[PDB]
Write a protein that binds this DNA or RNA. Sequence first.
RNA 1: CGCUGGGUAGCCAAGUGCGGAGCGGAUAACUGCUGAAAGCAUCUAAGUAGUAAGCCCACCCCAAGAUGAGUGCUCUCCUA
Length: 173
Amino acid sequence: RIGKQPITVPANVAIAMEGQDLKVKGPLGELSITYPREVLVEKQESGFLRVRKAVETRRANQMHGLFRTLTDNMVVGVSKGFEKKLQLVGVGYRATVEGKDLILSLGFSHPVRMAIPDELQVKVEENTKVTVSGRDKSVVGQFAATIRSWRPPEPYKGKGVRYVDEVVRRKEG
RNA sequence: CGCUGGGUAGCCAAGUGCGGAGCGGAUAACUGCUGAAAGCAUCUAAGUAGUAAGCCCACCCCAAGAUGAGUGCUCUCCUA
């Protein structure tokens, strides 16, 4: 299952294990997550962490696999980083950068002046598609959903803000 | 007011001014972000984001008999 899998820690990724807390030190940030009340972690003198249950119960079997893949997202998050590939479908849906902010002409009256945070490096390499880059997957997903929460792709319109190779329902009439 | 014609100050509107503000807080329905119990998944079981004329606060007034009777400033207790 999920919970029995060694944490693949790559090179130049320092593991810091503290009292009820994980402090990872990757080259692209230091993510910090408090341990659950029923999960105690063990290490075998290398780049392989193993979270372990502390009590025979159901909730430790919830946060065992949950906390397992969350620490996987910690180590892979601070080592390589996660990127989302949004795409503005259609004509006039242009997206560009204002230094600290990001502006989205989406067919409204005024283009949306949505502020990117400091932890995410976004890039517009072509005027439609926007690569939201970041360390942690949850912030990339929340801000990518926040940009997505203005114009979802309508089926008859066939034209909105969708991310790459995700199947979208379309209709003929 | 004998019946009429006008009218100051009052009162009144039909007249004249003003109000109904909030990237303030938490939510209901819903859309989600990572995401496990069934190595696939799923808005949730951990955490968390947008958001209702609805709830609360802010808004105007009364208001410590709020007996839980508040707080601050100031005055006065003399003669045998």
